[PDB]
Design a protein around this ligand. Structure first.
Ligand SMILES: Nc1ncnc2c1ncn2[C@@H]1O[C@H](COP(=O)(O)O)[C@@H](OP(=O)(O)O)[C@H]1O
Ligand SMILES: CC(C)NC[C@H]1CCc2cc(CO)c([N+](=O)[O-])cc2N1
Length: 256
């Protein structure tokens, strides 16, 4: 197909929850658009100063009405955070999908989904281990190597609670999490006009995504398959062993 000059503004809003293929999708959108896509990895590796800005935004977000003066202030901060990016995926952004749709009226919406039990299992190994899981101590040790402190964990928890619209949340309760998951995904498909939504099940690959976005399938490039919990476990253990990211980053080419 012909090469056309794409606008550097949010073109795709992904509502999918963490551990549903968001990093592969991030990589895929960057392969298509040749501009950055927002993701929790963007915060961790490139923009840790954003952490307090997202935390502030979530704090102020109860005061959003579907427009109040207070809404415009929030929308302005969201636009600021996302300047220069062509898409959003993952926490903390995914819970803001309705507001992003208002801010970027010409952006299309994605929902990444998968088997709820596979999701929970993945979440417990990477994002939200149970309190008494010994692996939690390893995650915390590796996170310190990355410069991540208590504020980072607060942002993760608060952004999840925001996505699920819960004032609080027993993170150690599998049944609660499974029910939030199903309710979240249900609500997205009820809220977004079907014309503006594409639901992507893990494994779907390039084809429905590229059709939805009116772009050619990238020539000779397989759809990304990254960020497995097995790989994240290896990253954690290597961070602990070497005590720096730059010592090991050559070992994790497409993940980081
Ligand atoms: N192209 C693909 N096909 C199948 N699974 C994929 C995939 N890309 C990512 N995944 C899976 O999606 C999860 C990562 O999601 P995220 O990037 O949102 O955190 C991982 O699940 P597992 O932890 O079960 O391996 C990963 O294996
Ligand atoms: C020990 C290291 C590997 N921990 C990985 C980092 C970096 C990867 C990571 C990703 C997410 C979600 O995309 C979350 N999260 O929302 O809790 C946390 C983290 N933490």
């Amino acid at each position: 197909g012909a090469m056309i000059e794409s606008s550097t503004t949010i073109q795709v809003i992904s509502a999918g929850l963490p551990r549903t293929g968001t990093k592969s999708l991030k990589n895929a959108l960057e392969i298509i658009y040749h501009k950055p896509c927002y993701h929790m990895f963007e915060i961790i590796f490139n923009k840790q100063s954003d952490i307090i800005k997202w935390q502030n935004l979530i704090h102020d977000s109860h005061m959003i009405t579907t427009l109040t003066t207070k809404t415009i202030a929030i929308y302005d901060k969201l636009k600021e955070l996302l300047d220069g990016y062509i898409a959003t995926t993952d926490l903390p952004t995914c819970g803001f999908y309705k507001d992003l749709m208002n801010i970027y009226p010409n952006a299309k919406v994605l929902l990444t989904i998968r088997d709820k039990y596979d999701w929970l299992h993945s979440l417990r190994k990477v994002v939200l281990p149970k309190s008494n899981d010994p692996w939690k101590l390893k995650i915390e040790e590796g996170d310190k190597v990355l410069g991540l402190n208590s504020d980072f964990y607060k942002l993760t928890e608060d952004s999840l609670k925001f996505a699920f619209q819960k004032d609080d949340l027993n993170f150690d309760d599998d049944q609660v999490l499974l029910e939030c998951y199903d309710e979240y995904n249900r609500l997205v498909q009820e809220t977004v006009p079907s014309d503006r939504l594409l639901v992507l099940r893990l494994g779907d690959g390039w084809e429905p995504l590229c059709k939805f976005l009116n772009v050619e399938i990238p020539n000779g490039i397989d759809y990304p398959c990254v960020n497995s919990h097995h790989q994240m476990t290896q990253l954690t253990e290597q961070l602990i062993k070497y005590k720096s990211l730059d010592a090991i980053i050559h070992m994790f080419p497409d993940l980081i």
